[PDB]
Amino acid sequence: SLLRRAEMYQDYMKQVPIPTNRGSLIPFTSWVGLSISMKQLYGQPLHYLTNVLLQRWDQSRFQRLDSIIHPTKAEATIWLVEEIHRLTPSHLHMALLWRSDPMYHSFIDPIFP
Ligand SMILES: [Cl-]
User: Fold this and answer.
1) Which UniProt keywords apply?
2) Contact 49, 89 (CB under 8 A)
3) What spacing in Å lies between the alpha carbon of 107 and ligand 1's midpoint?
4) Which CATH number covers residue 76?
């Protein structure tokens, strides 16, 4: 059941193309905020694992973030990690993660943002 949801989620996320954009600069002051600007400008979802990681990076800081990591590089890093999260995880692993995290749907993008 969770397993079917994981399988359908992952089968879908694995095929979503990474957008082709060299020549982008999105100023930002938190990782989660940069991710919201990316999801809105490109009209893309980011994966559960990427949303969780972005929130951890923001927690680890507790100066504008974009004066520390340039936006072009920051955005590229999110896309590269997102590609790992789309192409590599097994749905079984995702089902197991979701079974242990009652808040897990808060890190899944809505279908209609
Ligand atoms: Cl931001």
Assistant:
1) DNA-binding, Nucleus
2) yes
3) 17
4) 1.20.120.690
